[PDB]
Assembly symmetry: D2
Homo-oligomer: 243 residues x 4
């Protein structure tokens, strides 16, 4: 997270950390708890190449990475089959947990938006994670969970912005219709936040609009953060995850 | 270049080296001389983002990098407008030099294929460059130009390989129709070779079948090297190059 | 710390962590509380070159680095005037804190040895720290304080080991009389542990026999860990610490 | 070499490059040809730990490293036995070549000074090598041999300078009597030059005053380059190398 600050302990009960087996269980991506037994994340965190399940675990909402871990095994990785790279899209995946978590005030699911939901431009949304605090700048120990408010932007503007300073034909799409953008040169998601949630409070209730997917660096001019658009993939999500 | 060997001095007179300004004018991509005033390379060497022309030079065929540089400034960078990333395609670009070079036995242009040539499996093809000699393994000084003969694989076969060990749906195409596959686990191009030429000998003439573009690593199982298919982009090249 | 294990919370209440200002206040050396206002450490952690005091803080005993820091500024750095490098000796220094700390069961001072104590082979001794767990192998988060029991080796035996596989003349002393050796190929201190304490239990009291100083790597054949011998430097410590 | 420039092809015929076996025969130290069959270099380049002879070769005077190598095997490494670290001193070693080289205008020995020779302060001497051109700044390809003029300084001043900005007692020696200093904040030897020659022209003839040994960085304030003082070790050198 660039330009944000440490989250209050009561906030973002759905945030999770995906961990890879090594000399320690290292954080490499975020995710969100969307059902007691399901984690939503970005496909690029776990593909397109097939990876070993035993070398992956999930950590639910932690204020500081690694201090008090209770790692949860994963029973299935479901990567969207249209996924090959973030820039082509379908950057979305599900992790089925081996047990349903017992939900609490501190740890609980985020609500997915209705298919019709549209998140208008300018809407103050929030993204959260434990990724880099700027380009090639790691989150320092003790690794607080961070949060930052980012405005939604219309795809047409986000796409037009990606073309400024680029050779790509202005009529050749860069930001695709299953993506969603947010952020500016002060507030952005960054490396290690991927997979985690962009959430917007609508009618006083938090909806997951986006899954952190990619961008050109972090908080660079004319290069907002790009997210997988959750509404786009509801039917695929609901193919596996109970309403 | 993975596998293969140092090129003889008389071979590949069209090979060039692209250099970026820094503590020294460092090699970062290949290219090929296709006209006295034009270099063909990969878009991803020079975009998608617009860069300062003054920080880019071209070196014509040299047997060892850096030892006898005579660097040439560029007047224009022309990047295929459909290009955004190499995994999508249109990984192709043209550099116009400030001056026409003088050609000779040692330095001269490569011939572009006719539009109908498909370069099928079993064609004798070579890729050349000063790139890595394996995954994360730099070419050692004195940086000789390397070559390796690489076997062409049909696109459909190459696409199906790229699906082994992947989540990607089989009907979701990875290797596109504007790409070409060549190489195996002993013979491939690698980082640093991008933008340079894959050339095949057809009726005694060397034709540039491809431009080194991408792959999943270098010389890995089921992941042949991927090239931009030059025939696909002839009309675009000919909007600029006589 | 190579070998060994995470320290229990009730052990080593004198352990401290030295921090350098940067993107975060990073741990770079150990130390030991020897008085409420004084930390004992290795010179090479803080010299030979004079550094800005404002860029240095001390953290008192903490079970995990960084998680609950309450950092303490330093008023003075006092470096043994004979110190230049750790291989020569006098690798010892004192930090005076701006305020006296408050002591307790969890945080309190270590006892310095009487001048006559020599710490012979077979004494039970432990070294503690948040340093590397092997050569070029960082302590992983969450950075627990580690301990390991290390066997003392007589200086003369340690010196002769340091000569095996070396050109250095046998009569040319490597391990000096103001140093102490402990450890083997399974149990040692390592980078990051420097300045912290080697403590041995004598008549029921923990005595600080050494300050972690140097070695040829960590836990390598014939290269035990080398420590500054605290008894040698008592008079100097007592010029400053009550 | 810091602050210098590429040497003329005719100069420094005695300079050599020591090479270590790896993915290529990489330069790690300089040396000087002091007899047809002997190379003088710094002990720290080859010790104090005993190293494998087969993984070491010598390259005589090359204008550019690696372009035209003709590597020479070494038959013996002789490290001064009083050597353990550069800061304690005796940082001096000999390499005996397996063959005497056939000497030419382009490649030939440097003359060692007489035991009595004293190189007065202020004397313009030269150091040469293929080391870093500043602190943590590698010599770029194509690796020209560089040269720089550095003045000799008296040990007492070099030692006094090392004490400025240091905790070390002013009466506790840093620069020892078998060492020699030269250079300033514009002109210095640096990493990878170690082992190579500091040469001074006396009575119109080149004498090797120094062997590049150590220092605190390169060309830093109050921290001149320290050299092993060749006159100090003549009798040891002549114990092995014919007059
Ligand atoms: C790792 Si990759 C080179 O692409 Si990028 C992820 C650097 C990339 C591609 C296109 C646009 C952007 S934009 C961007 C970026 O700036 N990032 C990543 C996203 C990140 C981020 C993260 C979260 C949130 C935000 C929003 N602020 C931003 C910020 C930094 C990275 C990118 C890559 C992608 C997909 C498939 C492959 S396969 C592959 C690969 O294995 N190689 C590269 C090709 C190479 C090769 C060269 C020549 C010849 C051959 C044939 N043998 C092979 C071998 C090695 C690399 C890739
Ligand atoms: C950085 Si240094 C060469 O010492 Si070392 C740490 C590599 C070292 C010297 C001698 C023996 C050992 S043994 C060892 C080691 O293996 N370590 C460090 C200790 C560590 C450790 C730590 C704690 C506990 C243990 C016990 N298990 C072990 C394990 C790893 C390191 C060493 C050094 C020491 C003292 C003064 C200086 S000044 C200096 C310096 O600035 N440079 C080196 C010289 C160089 C130079 C070259 C040519 C010409 C010039 C003139 N311009 C300058 C410039 C850069 C470096 C040093
Ligand atoms: Cl929209
Ligand atoms: Cl071949
Ligand atoms: Cl133990
Ligand atoms: Cl003198």
């Amino acid at each position: 997270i660039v330009g944000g600050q440490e989250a209050p302990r009561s906030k973002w009960p759905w945030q999770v950390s995906l961990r890879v087996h090594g000399p320690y269980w290292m954080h490499f991506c975020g995710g969100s708890l969307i059902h007691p037994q399901w984690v939503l994340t970005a496909a690029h965190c776990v593909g397109p190449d097939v990876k070993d399940l035993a070398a992956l675990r999930v950590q639910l909402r932690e204020q500081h990475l690694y201090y008090q871990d209770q790692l949860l095994p994963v029973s299935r990785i479901i990567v969207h089959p249209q996924f090959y790279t973030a820039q082509i899209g379908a950057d979305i995946a599900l992790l089925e947990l081996e047990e349903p978590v017992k939900v609490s005030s501190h740890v609980h699911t985020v609500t997915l938006p209705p298919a019709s939901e549209t998140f208008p431009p300018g809407m103050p949304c929030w993204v959260t994670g434990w990724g880099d605090v700027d380009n090639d700048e790691r989150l320092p120990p003790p690794f607080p969970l961070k949060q930052v408010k980012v405005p939604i932007m219309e795809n047409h503007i986000c796409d037009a912005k990606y073309h400024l300073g680029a050779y790509t034909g202005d009529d050749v799409r860069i930001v695709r219709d299953d993506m969603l953008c947010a952020g500016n040169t002060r507030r952005d998601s960054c490396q290690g936040d991927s997979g985690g949630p962009l959430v917007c409070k609508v009618n006083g209730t938090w909806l997951q609009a986006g899954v952190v997917s990619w961008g050109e660096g972090c908080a660079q001019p004319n290069r907002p953060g790009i997210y997988t658009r959750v509404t786009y993939y509801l039917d695929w999500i609901h193919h596996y995850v109970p309403k």
